[PDB]
Amino acid sequence: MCLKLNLLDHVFANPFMNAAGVLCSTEEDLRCMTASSSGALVSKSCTSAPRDGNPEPRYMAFPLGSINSMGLPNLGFDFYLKYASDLHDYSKKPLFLSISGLSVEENVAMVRRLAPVAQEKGVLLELNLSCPNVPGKPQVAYDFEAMRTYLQQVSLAYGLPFGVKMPPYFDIAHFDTAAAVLNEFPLVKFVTCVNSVGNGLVIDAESESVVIKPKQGFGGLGGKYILPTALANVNAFYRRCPDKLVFGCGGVYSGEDAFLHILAGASMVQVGTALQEEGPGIFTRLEDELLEIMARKGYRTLEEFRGRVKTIE
């Protein structure tokens, strides 16, 4: 009995990793994730120049999940590149690097410099097409024409295997369109579903007040609120992109949620809000929980049930 996977020319002790943004902005965070039992890690989505992000409070967690409008704080692309180049221990686990520039030109500039490090070190790119929290910057992947441009330019400039972080959709025609756009780009080897559910609004009853400061309280939701949305996008893209990998993200607190993700078609499973709240010790729990589920069901590997959700009639 076995959680191991071999994908994108990398070996992974298990399918669990952090979700981009959680426990991965600093060298400290990145060392902690590397020392965890996770099968991999992804760095904070980054821009060319360092960013402070939005004013605090900008994240808040609740029994049923979280809301955030961080505003893309990060240490700058130079820092995450150098981390991949010179600091990361690839003998421990694979590293993904998330880039989330604010224009196609910014992203082009970044991937041109990442390319030789990817070739040398085998760092994998996750291209963020779904930040919902910087104003006047509505999410790329909700504009299919813009999405096409980003993927053309980045394929051209990068010329290596990468993946894309997608926002959730809520409409069959949008699964259709979005999956066909992706399938135009053979360098897109994986699709991460999903980023937070955009622009929800949490309100505290006692104080009569929104709980995060930026954007009049509006920010992205994660956690228990979004699991069924996440499972839908995962499976929508799994069925729609049979020559790609789907990484699942959204609402994972247990081996069971991870089990459902994987049934829906997920290869890697990312953990955001639950990791933010419980800390990196979550990865040992999730492993043991998933393994107990597999044992009880007689599954010996992940590939035995990946993508095998049953439909009725």
Next chain:
Amino acid sequence: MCLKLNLLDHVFANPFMNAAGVLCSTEEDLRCMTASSSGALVSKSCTSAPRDGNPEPRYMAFPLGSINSMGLPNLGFDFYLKYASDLHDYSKKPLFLSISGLSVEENVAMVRRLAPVAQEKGVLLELNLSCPNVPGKPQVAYDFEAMRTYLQQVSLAYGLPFGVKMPPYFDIAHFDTAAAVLNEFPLVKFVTCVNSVGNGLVIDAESESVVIKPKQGFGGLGGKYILPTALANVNAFYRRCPDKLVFGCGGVYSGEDAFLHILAGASMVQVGTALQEEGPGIFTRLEDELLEIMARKGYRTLEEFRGRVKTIE
């Protein structure tokens, strides 16, 4: 202290009502919601001809909410018109009628006949632009050009005050465009935010199966999953539509959840999943809870806190 209010030339005893689709398909259903202590009711969304809807199972509920792909089963516009014209007791509470024709022409044909009944009886139209559940018929209001077309045509054909049932949005530009489309139409007096969050997917871990039969298990989500999404939509349209009423729907289980909808901007508060699970007794509980919250806070009217959610700085 009493929560009575006046809107759309009608008096209401309290701001509560059922969500369209819940406890309102048959005469029996409608008499039951009429005899409840709700302040109003809305009828099941209808088409010109009777429909059986999708195959069962097509609704499932869970501690955190519901998923459905009912598929618009209804008794036919002729039945709900007759209920409106001859059977409803207007002395009890006002009545909203929901129409969900599958093309502009079908809607135009329905509202042409509703018009005289609305003149005579004051029944109120709720135009449904957001069924996420009929195959091949994606949500109207996620296509702004289609939405404009429906609102032009129904406005011309009906020539009387009506409201709209909107699907949730998740991006500021969409809020901007959607509210500006609405604002093009003076006859749109109210906006109901929100319909179910479209095309979620619920999976049963033990059985490894989706839980509803239509659309490979994909359906609309209601309940605790969507409260923050609903609040965001209510507030977004409340700020962007200063000259319309906003009706809140999504994730109401208690007087607190109603207080927050009203704080976000809600004039009426609709109840779907929680009413489906608890039954019409819920209406008396919700009233007592909301009145208890008002008293502890020193509020005497709804109008004192409606839309007065506070932001930080």
